[PDB]
Design a protein around this nucleic acid. Sequence first.
RNA 1: AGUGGCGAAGGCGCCCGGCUGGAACGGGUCCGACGGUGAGGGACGAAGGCCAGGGGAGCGAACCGGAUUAGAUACCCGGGUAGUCCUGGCUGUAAAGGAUGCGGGCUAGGUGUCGGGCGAGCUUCGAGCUCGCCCGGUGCCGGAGGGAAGCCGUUAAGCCCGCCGCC
RNA 2: GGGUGCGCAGCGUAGGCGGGAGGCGUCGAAGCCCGCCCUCCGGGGCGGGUGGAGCCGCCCAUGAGACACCGCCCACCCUCUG
Lengths: 127, 190
Amino acid sequence: KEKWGVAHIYSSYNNTIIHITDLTGAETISRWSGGMVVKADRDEPSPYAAMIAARRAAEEAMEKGITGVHIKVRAPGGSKSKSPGPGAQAAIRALSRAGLRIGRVEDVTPIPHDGTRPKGGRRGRRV
Amino acid sequence: RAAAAKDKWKMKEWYIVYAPDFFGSKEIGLTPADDPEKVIGRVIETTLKDLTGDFTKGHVKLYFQVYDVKGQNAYTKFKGHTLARSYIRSLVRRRTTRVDGIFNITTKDGYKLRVMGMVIAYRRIQTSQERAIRKIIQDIIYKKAEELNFADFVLQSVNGQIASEIAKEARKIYPIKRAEVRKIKVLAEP
RNA sequence: AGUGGCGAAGGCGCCCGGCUGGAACGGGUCCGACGGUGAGGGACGAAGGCCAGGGGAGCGAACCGGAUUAGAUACCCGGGUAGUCCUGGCUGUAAAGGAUGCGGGCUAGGUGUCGGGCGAGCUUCGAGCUCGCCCGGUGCCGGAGGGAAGCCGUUAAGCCCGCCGCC
RNA sequence: GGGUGCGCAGCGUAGGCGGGAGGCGUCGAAGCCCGCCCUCCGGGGCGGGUGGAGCCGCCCAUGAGACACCGCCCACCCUCUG
């Protein structure tokens, strides 16, 4: 029989997390970060690191018996940035190549109807 | 170690989820769990085409909640629905007008709902017209609620009848494109 | 969501209901010069600060730590107190700036947009669309003309009739 | 009770004792077909099935030799009872 899961991707300017669950999101299957596959902190969001972690997670999922997968991609959002990083697309293509079938794709970046104050300081960062 | 990990994964059994009765009882998917009661309370997100494959209504998302179990078969209830982000963003453009109403409803059977309906106009209209349109939405939804009950309410709201009525009667204040019902939440139950 | 609107200015953006202030348009309606400016006096007046009482998510002066640096009482990072919020009062300040005091008559226009009214054409008969005209608001160009120039130019920084503040 | 053993070189999970050159095949097996569990998924231990008569080892290594056959231990996470 064909079973479907869900891949949550959390992408940032500093790391990428790929997490595969069942359709309910209450049972976890695999979880891999860009910091498990490199040793430089400045490479955690490299799309190659993302590809590698995606491959590991996909192979573990297949071993567990997962065939299809829906996708929810996310940036931190809220008061932080609303734009994903560059590892998300890499991870998606890597999941496709690993051998899983892909279903729906959606963005779930949480966005403020009007909310809290960000960290700048009325003048932002000045480096 | 990995021994206990494999033990845990292999102690997990699979269950088959089933939609409710006023829909067609289908086989949305599968859920792993060790015990039966760790499955009571779980939300399956699906679309309406998967259930009844009309190619156009792919933007509608339904959310079914698990409430019971019998062997390795679980049965769901209806919880709410919302439209899709992509659709809404493609709708709301510049040099137009958006009119949203949020209302609290009680059907014939005592179910309490929160309904969020949406309307779009072709131009940058005034505010009195916005308010007239909002009143129209309100009247129609209250009428449909007092005359119908949960199953028909939901089926009509997701098929697109109430939207047609709303558009046709709001076309008397200002023409319209893509009127719709955008969200429903269930709040209570008798 | 606007280059948009209301308000004396400060300033004011979820929805429904109630109380309330002011302006424009239309008007063979009423009174009949009742007007302008305003020394001295008064009322409003961002943020921050103070008094008294409540509350306290996020942000975050002071403070404490990590780095960077010749040094770094800073910029960058991790934490954090008053304060930011409500009630009732004081303080009376700002690039509070159109850096342009208020009223009235005159000296070419063009093109947008907002509200109201009139007249033609369309219509899916819609509190709807388009074109033109009058009044009032708010913008962009521009000829004579003005200015040390930048520039302003019927929303004058032009020619006249007035009052107060200032150098 | 059911399952459970790569110190090396290895035909490969020689685990260790006493016996065991002898053990089996209608007290029916291979070679071929599909499958749950254990686990270093190493790899075997396990089951219904075309199948119908061969294969282990005294023969070499390894310090202790055979999953050669008979009795017993042990490391785990599990199924019943009192």
